[PDB]
Design a binder for this molecule. Structure first.
Ligand SMILES: Cc1cn([C@H]2C[C@H](N=[N+]=[N-])[C@@H](COP(=O)(O)O)O2)c(=O)[nH]c1=O
Ligand SMILES: Cc1cn([C@H]2C[C@H](N=[N+]=[N-])[C@@H](COP(=O)(O)O)O2)c(=O)[nH]c1=O
Ligand SMILES: [Cl-]
Ligand SMILES: [Cl-]
Ligand SMILES: [Cl-]
Lengths: 197, 203
């Protein structure tokens, strides 16, 4: 049995360096670590990501964007995430369904219930064991074209979701000195290892 | 007030030769016709189509394939189908959700209940007003499809064929089954025969 950990938050929050940090802590304890990201994580998922990010003169329907995001997820689950967990590996996934509630839900305004329906439809009972929210104040692809209010509603959705399920989430103040943040990651580790074992 | 007509069946069933005939019967009667096809029908929906058709060493999960089909459908609905019906055009759409039940359901073995939930999720209350099923026994009659579906065996395609006939029989009011194996004159007669009912559905 393995463990499914997701990381959510914007760039410049240190997600990658901190994911590397966590990954080294686990690896030095003999635990296999599978790094991955969404949307993407397999050849086909990465091609779907390309459609998602590529600007176009044709407006992408909201449902189209939502269904593509979940198509990439479906493929990623089958190709990478589930097999990793089956190996007893710890998956460190940069962005997952919380990013859907945040971007397609908070950002775009899609009803949370439609996102919930697809989450269950695609994932069955699988949810992350732990979700690390890297929180900090707020050419381009389709999403980077968006405005400050979009990214503000994005930020707030992570915190709202994190607040409703405090046991599954750990919110990190990415505005804190890196050293302090990684100290937080160290304090999370025992519980992580306990979960895994 | 338009009419949403879909055409189902494999390649070499005459769907296109038949669609052109049907489209002209409508046009000569002063009726606007919108030709389209799935997966695809808009630039983004065609990009999705090409992903679905592209061979790869990585197997596409059945759910991935189902979701991409519906993603293309949602874009196509918004950009072509709903507008056309709104203008009061007759949409003649090559392939639609019946192909999903047939390919993803019958072929891939996905449960009909899962397909139905997506159908509703994406389409709301919109379903075809009339579906023409061009029924053809599995007939290989040069390089093949040249796409992902080329690799599937006869059993897969038998299941596809049978799914169409089962759906048509379950709701005879909405489907017309044509024998696409007939000489083209006789298929045209089939089109001629169903035309008056199609017209009555429009007004
Ligand atoms: C996984 C996921 C990502 N996204 C967005 C977040 C990102 N847009 N920004 N900023 C983009 C991912 O690109 P990056 O991983 O390079 O950040 O896709 C969603 O909108 N929904 C999702 O479910
Ligand atoms: C519309 C639709 C098509 N398809 C398949 C049927 C076809 N493969 N074969 N034979 C392919 C459509 O391409 P053609 O119409 O050019 O044949 O996509 C689906 O699997 N699901 C769908 O929902
Ligand atoms: Cl973010
Ligand atoms: Cl990654
Ligand atoms: Cl067409």
């Amino acid at each position: 049995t393995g463990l499914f950990v997701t990381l959510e938050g914007p760039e410049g929050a240190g997600k990658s360096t901190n994911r590397d940090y966590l990954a080294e802590r686990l690896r030095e304890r003999g635990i296999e670590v599978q790094l991955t990201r969404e949307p993407g994580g397999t050849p086909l998922a990465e091609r779907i990501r390309e459609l998602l990010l590529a600007p176009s003169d044709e407006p992408m329907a909201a449902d189209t964007e939502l269904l593509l995001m979940f198509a990439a997820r479906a493929q990623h689950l089958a190709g990478v995430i589930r097999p990793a967990l089956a190996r007893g590996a710890v998956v460190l996934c940069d962005r997952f369904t919380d990013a859907t509630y945040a971007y397609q839900g908070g950002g775009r305004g899609l009803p949370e219930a439609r996102i919930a329906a697809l989450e269950s439809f695609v994932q069955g009972d699988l949810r992350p064991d732990l979700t690390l929210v890297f929180d900090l104040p707020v050419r381009l692809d389709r999403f980077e074209q968006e405005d400050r209010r979009f990214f503000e509603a994005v930020r707030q959705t992570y915190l709202q979701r994190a607040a409703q399920a405090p046991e599954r989430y750990q919110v990190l103040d990415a505005g804190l000195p890196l050293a302090e943040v990684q100290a937080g990651l160290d304090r999370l580790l025992p519980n992580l290892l306990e979960r895994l074992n």
